[PDB]
């Protein structure tokens, strides 16, 4: 309808009718628009979550640099924050803990060591790739898994003319106790190219 | 209800089309292939020879009339033939081992398969010039981009009705070449919107 | 139809298709009443004159200069070592899908555009 | 049908990966079944 347009003051009545507020970014409002703000902890307690959620959740009151105090959650196993400790907070809402609308950041913060046990989430737990884990990703050699089907095929069209590796052509693949050799050009191609290249 | 025995009516438009439940039915369609490849390779050599021999007597248009080839199609035959021969005489590389995109590789397979089933064409079958005919060429053919309308509405009367407003041509800028030198290329910018020519 | 006639006249005069030249016909003329047709006919004449007489043989400028400074280059077998490649087929390995419509426009489109109209490259000059 | 969005390089690499991967999966499945019958069945 156009009922709201009537009157010579239509340019001052309609525009003054605000629909609603801004639902988004309604909780995180003490940051003054900054992505992150540093703070210092002055109280450490354990707040019991509301029903029906049982258990205990660790929380701490962190004083922001802007002279404002607000509870912050410390996700992850273990605990190292104490009285008069500097920790960097971020956005995030916690349903179990009422009122808390902030989360701490591991690693970048001060006097906050790395997580105890975690392999799946790396960035989240600010855990760097260990040397042992990196070495495991390079081991790729599990191709030798011949079966009975290959044995019959080999001794039908690939046993007359076939060059072995060391110095010999004619081998004994027909023997059951013997094992059919591997390919000298295709088998383990990706691993061979990488190992022979780094050797310089 | 009405009589109109012709092949340009609303129902007759786009004949042999799925209108109903048959749209989702899978149907095989013929594979298209360019005309310059369906011709006999033998004739291509012959055509090329003539062109390269005497361009005056054997012009681009006259040569294509005898064999029934378009002016654009005949040009590609000489160009594609030239390069193939150049690499063989000079002993550079074989045509099979030549590097080319994947779009051409699949085209070559179709050309060989086309002849293996039916055979090569001894003479081309195409018209040199176009002809104004009623055909469906895309979705932009049955639409008026000037007036931006699909349905035309007019008054019904026996007396002469006033004519409609004719459109005007669109004036756009173009460029031309005046002086060309090995170390410099001079060009002129034409502005049709300028009243003073000078 | 015009081009057919014109093109035919020239051949008769020269008697190309004749083992034994018998020069008898040395005068060919065309007469047309229609002004419109007459004008058109003239055009055909021009085209006929081209590619026949050496004094009216045009040639694009880009290829004319190349043809003048001709040289003999000797290429040995060892000079084509890097020309050969391993892969047989080739195709685009990076989609042209733009990520940022605004960031790219104000970085590689606006600076390279100095005109308010879309103009394509003009054709070469004939010499 | 939705259009492709992945890089061509990745697309092409996926086919190469399957050349040696695929055959191993087929042999790995029959290895357990065949061995079970030769010792129990």
């Amino acid at each position: 309808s156009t009922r709201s347009i009537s009157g010579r003051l239509f340019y001052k009545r309609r525009p003054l009718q605000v629909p609603k507020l801004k639902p988004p970014n309604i909780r995180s409002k003490w940051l003054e628009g900054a992505p992150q703000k540093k703070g210092i902890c002055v109280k450490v307690r354990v707040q019991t979550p509301r029903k029906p959620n049982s258990g205990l959740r660790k929380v701490a009151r962190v004083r922001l640099s802007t002279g404002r105090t607000v509870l912050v959650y410390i996700p992850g196993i273990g605990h190292n924050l104490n009285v008069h400790s500097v920790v960097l907070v971020r956005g995030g809402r916690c349903k179990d803990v009422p009122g808390c609308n902030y989360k701490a950041v591991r690693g970048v913060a001060d006097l906050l060591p790395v997580k105890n046990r975690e392999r799946k989430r790396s960035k989240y737990g600010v855990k760097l790739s260990s040397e042992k884990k990196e070495w495991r990703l390079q081991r790729w050699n599990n191709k030798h898994l011949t079966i009975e089907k290959d044995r019959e095929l080999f001794n039908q069209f690939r046993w007359m003319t076939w060059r072995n590796e060391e110095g010999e052509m004619r081998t004994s693949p027909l023997a059951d106790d013997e094992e059919v050799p591997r390919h000298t050009q295709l088998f383990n191609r990706w691993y061979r190219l990488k190992m022979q290249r780094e050797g310089k | 209800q009405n009589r109109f025995p012709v092949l340009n009516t609303a129902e007759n438009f786009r004949y042999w089309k799925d209108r109903g439940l048959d749209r989702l039915l899978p149907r095989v369609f013929p594979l298209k292939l360019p005309a310059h490849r369906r011709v006999d390779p033998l004739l291509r050599e012959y055509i090329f020879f003539l062109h390269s021999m005497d361009p005056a007597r054997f012009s681009i248009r006259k040569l294509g009339e005898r064999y029934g080839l378009k002016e654009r199609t005949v040009e590609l035959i000489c160009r594609e033939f030239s390069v193939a021969e150049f690499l063989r005489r000079t002993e550079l590389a074989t045509p099979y081992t030549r590097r080319v995109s994947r779009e051409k590789a699949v085209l070559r397979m179709k050309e060989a398969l086309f002849s293996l089933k039916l055979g090569y064409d001894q003479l081309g079958d195409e018209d040199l010039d176009e002809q104004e005919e009623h055909e469906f060429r895309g979705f932009r053919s049955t639409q008026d981009w000037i007036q931006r309308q699909n349905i035309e509405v007019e008054m019904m009367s026996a007396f002469p009705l006033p004519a409609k407003r004719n459109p005007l041509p669109k004036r756009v800028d173009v460029d031309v070449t005046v002086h060309n030198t090995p170390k410099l290329k001079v060009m002129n910018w034409i502005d049709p919107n300028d009243k003073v020519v000078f | 139809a015009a081009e057919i006639l014109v093109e035919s006249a020239v051949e008769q005069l020269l008697q190309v298709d004749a083992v034994d030249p018998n020069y008898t016909l040395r005068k060919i003329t065309f007469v047309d009443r229609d002004a419109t047709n007459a004008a058109l006919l003239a055009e055909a004449a021009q085209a006929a004159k081209r590619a026949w007489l050496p004094e009216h043989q045009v040639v694009p400028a880009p290829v004319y200069w190349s043809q003048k400074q001709r040289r003999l280059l000797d290429v040995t077998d060892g000079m084509l070592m890097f020309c050969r490649k391993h892969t047989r087929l080739s195709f685009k390995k990076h989609h042209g899908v733009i990520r940022r419509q605004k960031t790219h426009y104000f970085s590689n489109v606006r600076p390279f555009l100095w005109r308010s109209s879309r103009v394509l490259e003009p054709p070469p000059l004939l010499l | 049908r939705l259009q492709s969005r992945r890089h061509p390089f990745w697309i092409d690499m996926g086919y190469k990966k399957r050349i040696v991967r695929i055959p191993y999966l087929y042999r790995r499945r029959v290895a357990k079944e065949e061995a079970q019958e030769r010792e129990f069945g």
Binding site: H144, E165, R192, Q196 | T97, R98 | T87 | A35
Partner: peptide
């Protein structure tokens, strides 16, 4: 899966690169 890794090739057997035989225009 009964066979693990007994005979392996790391540097003992080299790999011949792909020769060049496709001239590019």
């Amino acid at each position: 899966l009964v066979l693990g890794s007994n005979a392996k090739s790391l540097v003992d057997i080299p790999v011949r690169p792909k020769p060049r035989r496709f001239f590019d225009l």
